[PDB]
Structures are given as C-alpha cells and as structure tokens.
Amino acid sequence: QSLAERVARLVAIDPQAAAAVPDKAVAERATQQGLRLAQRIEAFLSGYGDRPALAQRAFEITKDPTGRAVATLLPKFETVSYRELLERSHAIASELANHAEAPVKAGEFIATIGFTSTDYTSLDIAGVLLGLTSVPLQTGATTDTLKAIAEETAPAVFGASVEHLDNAVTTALATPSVRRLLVFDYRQGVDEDREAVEAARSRLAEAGSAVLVDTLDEVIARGRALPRVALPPATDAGDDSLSLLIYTSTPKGAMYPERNVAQFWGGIWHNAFPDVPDIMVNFMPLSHVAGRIGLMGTLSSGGTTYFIAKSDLSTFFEDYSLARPTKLFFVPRICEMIYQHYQSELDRIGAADGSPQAEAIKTELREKLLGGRVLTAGSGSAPMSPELTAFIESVLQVHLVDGYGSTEAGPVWRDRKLVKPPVTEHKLIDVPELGYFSTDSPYPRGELAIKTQTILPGYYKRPETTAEVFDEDGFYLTGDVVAEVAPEEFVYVDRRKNVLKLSQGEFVALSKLEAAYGTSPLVRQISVYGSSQRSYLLAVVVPTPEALAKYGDGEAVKSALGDSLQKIAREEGLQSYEVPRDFIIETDPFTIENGILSDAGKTLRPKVKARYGERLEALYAQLAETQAGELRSIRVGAGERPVIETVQRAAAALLGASAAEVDPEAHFSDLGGDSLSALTYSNFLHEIFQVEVPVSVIVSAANNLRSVAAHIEKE
Numbered sequence: 001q002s003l004a005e006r007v008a009r010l011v012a013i014d015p016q017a018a019a020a021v022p023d024k025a026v027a028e029r030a031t032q033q034g035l036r037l038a039q040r041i042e043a044f045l046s047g048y049g050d051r052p053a054l055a056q057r058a059f060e061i062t063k064d065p066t067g068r069a070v071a072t073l074l075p076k077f078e079t080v081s082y083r084e085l086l087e088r089s090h091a092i093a094s095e096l097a098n099h100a101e102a103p104v105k106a107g108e109f110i111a112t113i114g115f116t117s118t119d120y121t122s123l124d125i126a127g128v129l130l131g132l133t134s135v136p137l138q139t140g141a142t143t144d145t146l147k148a149i150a151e152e153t154a155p156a157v158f159g160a161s162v163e164h165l166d167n168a169v170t171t172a173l174a175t176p177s178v179r180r181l182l183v184f185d186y187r188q189g190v191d192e193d194r195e196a197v198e199a200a201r202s203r204l205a206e207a208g209s210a211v212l213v214d215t216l217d218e219v220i221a222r223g224r225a226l227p228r229v230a231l232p233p234a235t236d237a238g239d240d241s242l243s244l245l246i247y248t249s250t251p252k253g254a255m256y257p258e259r260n261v262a263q264f265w266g267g268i269w270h271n272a273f274p275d276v277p278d279i280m281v282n283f284m285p286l287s288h289v290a291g292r293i294g295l296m297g298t299l300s301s302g303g304t305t306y307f308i309a310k311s312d313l314s315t316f317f318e319d320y321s322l323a324r325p326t327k328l329f330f331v332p333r334i335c336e337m338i339y340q341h342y343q344s345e346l347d348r349i350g351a352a353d354g355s356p357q358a359e360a361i362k363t364e365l366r367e368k369l370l371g372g373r374v375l376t377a378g379s380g381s382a383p384m385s386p387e388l389t390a391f392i393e394s395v396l397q398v399h400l401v402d403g404y405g406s407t408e409a410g411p412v413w414r415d416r417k418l419v420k421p422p423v424t425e426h427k428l429i430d431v432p433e434l435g436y437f438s439t440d441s442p443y444p445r446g447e448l449a450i451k452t453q454t455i456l457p458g459y460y461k462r463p464e465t466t467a468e469v470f471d472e473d474g475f476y477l478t479g480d481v482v483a484e485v486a487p488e489e490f491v492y493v494d495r496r497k498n499v500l501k502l503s504q505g506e507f508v509a510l511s512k513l514e515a516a517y518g519t520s521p522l523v524r525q526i527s528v529y530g531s532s533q534r535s536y537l538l539a540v541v542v543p544t545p546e547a548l549a550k551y552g553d554g555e556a557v558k559s560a561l562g563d564s565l566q567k568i569a570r571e572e573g574l575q576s577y578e579v580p581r582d583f584i585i586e587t588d589p590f591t592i593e594n595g596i597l598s599d600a601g602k603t604l605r606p607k608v609k610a611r612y613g614e615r616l617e618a619l620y621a622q623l624a625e626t627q628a629g630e631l632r633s634i635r636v637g638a639g640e641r642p643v644i645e646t647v648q649r650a651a652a653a654l655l656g657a658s659a660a661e662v663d664p665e666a667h668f669s670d671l672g673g674d675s676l677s678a679l680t681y682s683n684f685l686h687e688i689f690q691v692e693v694p695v696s697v698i699v700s701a702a703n704n705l706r707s708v709a710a711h712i713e714k715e
C-alpha cells in the first residue's frame with residue numbers, strides 16, 4: 001500500500017510521528033538563494049527550536065559495592081531539542097573564538113576522533129559557525145595514519161571522545177600546530193572518564209607540552225556566558241570556503257566546500273534514498289559521508305536522530321526497538337548481521353526457510369526488534385547481493401532503495417537511475433585491460449564517468465591525484481565498472497581495483513563474489529582472494545559461531561563451506577572458477593578496532609592482504625609443492641623399490657588421489673586421468689626407468705596399473 005497512505009495512518013495513530021512531520025515554511029527560509037551554510041543551519045535549528053532533535057540513552061551513575069562510580073544505561077532514551085543543540089553549538093564557538101591564550105579564528109583546522117553523538121554533532125556545528133575546516137578522523141586508523149593526516153592539515157584544535165583520548169594525545173604530541181585538546185562524550189561523575197582526562201594531562205605535562213585540555217562540558221559552560229560569534233564567518237571565499245575534509249583512500253582528503261556541505265542539510269542528498277516524519281537511528285561515524293547524510297537530512301527535515309548506545313554495535317536491536325525508527329539506512333554488513341540473526345534463530349527453533357515459523361521470526365524482526373514503524377528504507381556504500389535484498393524486503397515489507405554514490409561525486413544513482421540534478425552528463429569508458437567494452441553482451445560495460453554539480457574541487461594539497469581522476473574532457477572517473485541495462489539505467493559490477501585476472505584469462509569481480517557468498521548460512525564474514533599467477537580463488541572466512549561448533553575450524557568446515565558456496569554459485573549462475581577452492585579460517589571477526597573494517601563497515605582489501613596475504617600465498621604455493629616434493633621422492637627412490645609402488649605413487653601424486661583409491665587393479669581412467677595427463681605420466685616414467693611407455697599402454701581400458709608396471713619390467 002502507498003507511502004502517502006501508510007504515513008497518513010501512522011500520523012493519525014502516533015502523536016510522536018505527527019509532531020515530526022517536516023514544516024515547509026522552515027525549509028523555504030533555510031534553503032533560499034544566497035544564504036551562507038552557517039545561516040542555513042541557524043534557520044533549521046531555530047525554526048524547529050522546541051522539537052526533539054537528538055537522543056542518547058539515559059543512564060544513572062552507580063557505585064560498585066571497588067566503590068567506583070560508573071554510567072549504567074537504562075532501557076530509555078532522552079532528547080535534546082533543536083534549540084538546546086543550537087545554544088551549545090554557539091557556546092562552543094563562542095568559547096573557542098574568545099579564548100585568552102589559544103583563540104581560534106576562521107580558516108583554521110580542527111581534527112576529531114569520535115563516534116557519533118550529541119557532543120560530536122554540536123562540535124561539527126560549532127566548527128561551521130566559526131568558519132573552521134573540520135577533519136573528522138577514522139576511529140580504527142592506526143596512530144601512524146592519524147599523525148600523517150594531522151601533518152597535512154596542521155590543526156589548531158584537536159577534539160576526541162573519551163574512548164579515543166589516548167590516541168588523540170599521542171597524535172597531539174607529534175603535531176606542533178595543536179594548541180587545544182577538547183574531550184567530549186564526557187560524563188561528569190564517571191570515574192573512568194575523570195581518570196582518562198587526568199591521564200591525558202599528566203602525559204602532556206610529562207612530555208613538557210603546553211597543549212591545553214578541556215572537556216566540552218566546561219567549554220560550553222563558559223561559552224554560555226559569552227556573546228555569540230557573528231554569522232556568517234569571515235572566511236576568504238564565501239560558498240567556496242573549505243568547510244570539511246573527508247578522508248577516503250592511502251588516505252586522501254576530499255575537499256568539501258561550504259556549498260557541498262550545505263547539500264547534506266536539506267539539499268541534494270535528500271534525493272539519495274510526500275511529507276514523511278524522519279525518526280532514525282544513527283550507527284555511522286561522522287568520519288564517513290553516510291553518517292552525515294542521515295544525521296543532517298533529519299536535522300534539516302525537523303525529525304529526530306537516536307544515537308546507538310555503544311561504538312561496537314552490541315546494543316543494536318535494543319536501540320532500534322526503543323527508538324522505533326520511521327526511516328532506515330543500511331549498509332550490507334548490517335543487513336548481513338540481520339540475516340545472520342534470522343538464521344541462528346532458525347537453527348535454534350529448528351525450522352525451515354519457507355515456513356510459518358520462520359515468517360514469525362521475520363514478523364518479530366519487523367514489529368519488535370526494528371520497532372514496527374518503518375515507512376522507508378535505503379542502502380548504499382557497497383554492493384548488495386539480490387538474495388539479501390529480497391530477504392530484507394520480505395522482513396521490512398517496504399522497497400529497499402539502492403543509492404550509489406561516493407565521497408567524491410555525491411549521489412550518482414538511485415535504483416539504477418541517474419539523479420539529475422546533480423548529475424549533468426555521463427558515459428561509459430571501455431576498459432580493454434579488464435575485458436569491459438560497450439559492445440559486450442548482453443549489456444554494454446565499462447568505467448562510469450560523470451560530470452556532476454556536486455563534484456569535489458580536488459583532494460587536499462594533492463593536485464596530481466586530483467588530475468588523475470579527471471579525463472581529458474573534465475569527466476570524473478569513478479573507478480567503478482558498471483553495466484548499462486537500459487537507457488540511463490545502470491547496475492554496478494565492481495571497482496576497477498577489485499577486478500582480478502586469473503592465470504587462464506578469466507576476469508573476476510571480487511567484491512561481487514563476497515556479496516554473493518555472504519548469504520551462505522555458514523558465513524559470518526568473507527574476503528575473497530586472487531593472484532594473477534593462479535587459476536583459482538581462495539578466501540578468508542570467519543564462520544558463524546554455529547558453523548564453528550558443528551564443523552570445527554579444520555577440513556570439515558572447509559568442506560562444508562565449499563558445498564555452501566557451490567550451491568550459491570549454481571543458484572546465481574556463477575562459473576566454477578568463481579568459487580574459492582580453499583580457505584583460511586579465522587575465528588576472530590574483522591572489526592573497525594582491528595583495522596579490517598572501515599568506519600562504513602566495509603571489508604578493506606589491502607588490510608586483509610597485509611594481515612593474511614603471506615598465509616594465503618603459502619596456501620596457493622603448497623598444493624603443487626607437496627606434489628612436486630612427492631614426485632621428486634619417487635624419482636629418487638625408484639632404482640630400489642617395487643616398480644608397482646612407483647607406478648602407484650606416481651599415478652596418485654600426478655592425478656590427486658589418496659593411496660587408498662590407488663589399487664594395483666585400478667585403471668588410470670578411474671583415478672581421473674585423460675590421455676593428456678597420460679602423456680605427462682608416460683614422460684615421468686620414461687625419465688626414471690629409461691623405458692618407453694606409450695599413451696596407449698596407459699589409456700587403453702584393457703589395462704590397469706599392474707598392466708603398466710608389467711610392461712615396464714619387460715625391458
């Protein structure tokens with residue numbers, strides 16, 4: 001049933017939903033021609049002033065009976081109003097501009113490590129009100145890459161949530177431009193939080209740093225009693241002032257000028273995925289554009305965002321079931337987690353996939369776990385297997401809009417269809433080297449190139465890298481191979497990076513195989529791997545906890561996995577060479593913490609390579625190396641052993657048989673051996689015994705391994 005209808009029905013029943021319906025008078029004021037970014041924000045936030053804007057889990061400070069005070073979360077959320085959000089943002093800008101010994105002025109850089117929360121959001125806004133350039137850093141970046149980014153940007157202020165404070169300190173000690181360290185998501189009364197700050201200031205004192213440390217609490221309490229800074233900020237370049245850098249990947253900073261940041265705030269990104277009330281959960285760091293799109297789309301539509309309680313997603317279902325969102329934004333790995341929930345719940349009940357009992361599990365997901373108020377849903381940032389899409393769609397009972405886009409280009413398509421605006425022109429470029437051409441069947445393929453109104457001005461302090469991503473006609477080269485399936489309708493194949501050429505000249509799209517194989521019930525996470533010297537694929541598989549218990553982590557989980565991936569291969573119409581033949585089994589999941597997952601939740605190929613690459617190569621190497629060691633052992637001992645043993649071992653080794661299935665009565669034909677492999681075998685035998693053995697003596701169904709051993713001995 002239609003969206004207008006489902007909304008109308010919700011807003012009759014649900015006063016919370018009714019109060020969150022967008023107000024057009026506010027949107028017209030905030031979006032009018034000429035208004036600078038900071039003024040656009042001020043208009044949304046004052047215009048919706050009384051409404052609930054943001055929500056965090058309520059808590060109480062408990063004592064252990066250790067004695068220590070700690071924050072104990074409650075099954076309840078608490079809201080900060082749009083007006084309260086605006087005040088505290090202004091209190092931050094005011095205190096930062098007016099500081100007595102280390103003030104900050106428009107144009108200066110601020111860097112931040114944090115998750116996503118009320119404080120982080122209010123610091124983002126403070127930055128725009130001050131005209132700062134903000135550089136939000138990846139929560140799982142190593143300290144080395146944090147220092148490298150702090151080097152390029154030279155920030156004057158460094159902000160960090162309590163839990164990243166230690167890595168912030170390390171980075172600030174290596175970064176002479178940093179004058180202040182601000183500490184946020186800080187809770188007065190919590191002993192962990194107080195001792196983190198005291199450790200930060202001892203560490204800085206001990207190294208003799210003059211870097212000042214303050215919590216955001218205190219910054220705001222000071223700012224509150226100060227006059228507001230004047231809008232818009234006195235930057236150098238109006239709408240082209242550099243407002244944000246988003247780091248992408250080696251890390252490059254994509255420049256977001258004020259006019260492109262403004263698109264998050266009620267501009268072109270609301271097309272990315274009637275007057276719908278926006279109530280959303282946010283699980284995505286502000287380090288990544290997906291965090292922003294939800295967060296600012298909802299701020300700018302007068303809705304409410306509910307922040308997930310813990311960085312590590314361990315409170316996911318509880319928060320969704322309390323917050324009961326109207327809009328869902330997913331990424332594949334989140335849909336996979338949902339699918340993994342359904343599937344382990346399916347084992348535990350002992351029900352099959354098509355059944356009423358399984359449909360109740362879905363119903364539970366839809367009504368309880370996800371809150372039962374879902375009106376729309378979208379996904380993006382990585383490719384979704386069609387099976388998973390249909391699963392999510394059946395659970396939610398809405399269409400899952402697919403949005404393709406990038407940090408660089410902004411939103412590019414929505415359910416295959418170019419989003420115009422901002423896209424003005426496009427084309428496909430052939431990629432001969434990866435075997436992709438506009439003449440291909442059944443569809444034209446190649447690299448998508450675009451001209452778009454939201455294209456980045458460039459990468460920060462990287463003019464050469466900036467020139468690499470445009471072709472001679474000024475089209476942006478997405479790096480992404482696509483398939484045109486109808487006029488101006490595209491489907492994603494893969495990044496150019498992710499396409500591998502196997503040694504027999506077949507081309508694989510690696511990220512597409514991971515999406516496909518991620519709906520194996522045995523698979524928790526998968527990374528597929530290739531080498532151009534090899535004719536088959538490997539994979540790094542984290543099996544599910546259930547698979548581990550049932551099969552272990554040795555040959556039996558590999559063999560089970562194999563069957564499972566074969567079955568997807570056949571069902572999806574993939575080739576035999578697209579199925580991995582062996583595995584590295586990992587019992588410890590890829591995480592953001594580990595460096596294997598990005599802040600968006602994507603599996604990072606080069607981080608898999610750096611960790612597992614050696615073990616994977618050694619696994620490619622060992623197959624032929626064992627066989628070669630055996631052939632050499634047999635060559636070396638043959639002038640002193642029963643000719644029949646030689647014949648058997650040679651046959652076993654060459655074809656891939658266990659000694660068990662090599663009987664002296666077996667036919668070379670039985671053990672997998674065509675007449676091409678019989679010539680290799682004849683040559684081997686000729687080399688060690690000095691006697692001629694025709695390929696007739698091996699392939700003839702008259703003969704068997706005694707027959708062969710017989711022939712040789714008669715000479």
Ligand SMILES: Nc1ncnc2c1ncn2[C@@H]1O[C@H](COP(=O)(O)O)[C@@H](O)[C@H]1O
Pocket residue numbers: 248289379380381382383384402403404405406407408478479480492494495
């Ligand atoms: N909806 C989507 N489907 C498939 N791949 C996607 C989608 N959105 C983004 N991507 C991939 O993610 C990249 C964006 O990377 P980033 O710059 O980190 O956001 C794109 O260039 C694609 O390779």
